[PDB]
Amino acid sequence: GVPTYGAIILDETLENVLLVQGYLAKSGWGFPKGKVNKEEAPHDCAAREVFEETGFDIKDYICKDDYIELRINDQLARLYIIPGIPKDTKFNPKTRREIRNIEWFSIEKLPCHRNDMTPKSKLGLAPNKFFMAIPFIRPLRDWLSRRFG
Numbered sequence: 001g002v003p004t005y006g007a008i009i010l011d012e013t014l015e016n017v018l019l020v021q022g023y024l025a026k027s028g029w030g031f032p033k034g035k036v037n038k039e040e041a042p043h044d045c046a047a048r049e050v051f052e053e054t055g056f057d058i059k060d061y062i063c064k065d066d067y068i069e070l071r072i073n074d075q076l077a078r079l080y081i082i083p084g085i086p087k088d089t090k091f092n093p094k095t096r097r098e099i100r101n102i103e104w105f106s107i108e109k110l111p112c113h114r115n116d117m118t119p120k121s122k123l124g125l126a127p128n129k130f131f132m133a134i135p136f137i138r139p140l141r142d143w144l145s146r147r148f149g
């Protein structure tokens with residue numbers, strides 16, 4: 001697949017992250033992000049995807065080195081970490097045909113792994129509406145420790 005870029009936006013306490021919920025195949029919650037255009041810089045793709053999905057402009061806050069990148073089934077997803085955005089900020093998508101909802105979620109209440117089905121003697125993972133966000137939660141928790149303490 002083609003690389004995706006986006007943001008992990010945090011509030012002022014650093015307790016909460018901003019997630020978006022899509023429709024149909026993208027019906028769960030995740031960080032706002034999307035596919036790079038041809039010849040587009042990562043930081044510009046991130047700013048654009050976040051603006052389209054949330055109405056918030058991260059251009060003046062992105063730090064070029066502050067991101068978490070994961071290759072997930074051979075698809076790179078890089079999310080720039082944007083701390084300190086006020087929780088009263090009013091978010092409104094441009095592409096409202098693709099975004100159902102936009103909400104803050106507590107980091108400490110988000111899972112950092114999905115639960116198994118071992119009490120059912122069944123292999124695999126139970127469905128989780130935070131599936132897309134989950135792989136970033138531990139690395140974010142470790143980046144926040146290392147940056148802020």
Ligand SMILES: CCn1cnc(C(=O)NCc2ccc(F)cc2)c1
Nearest residue numbers: 020021022025026027028029030132
């Ligand atoms: C099981 C696969 N799946 C479920 N939900 C997603 C998902 O990415 N939701 C968040 C989102 C981000 C951006 C966007 F434009 C629309 C939705 C992926």
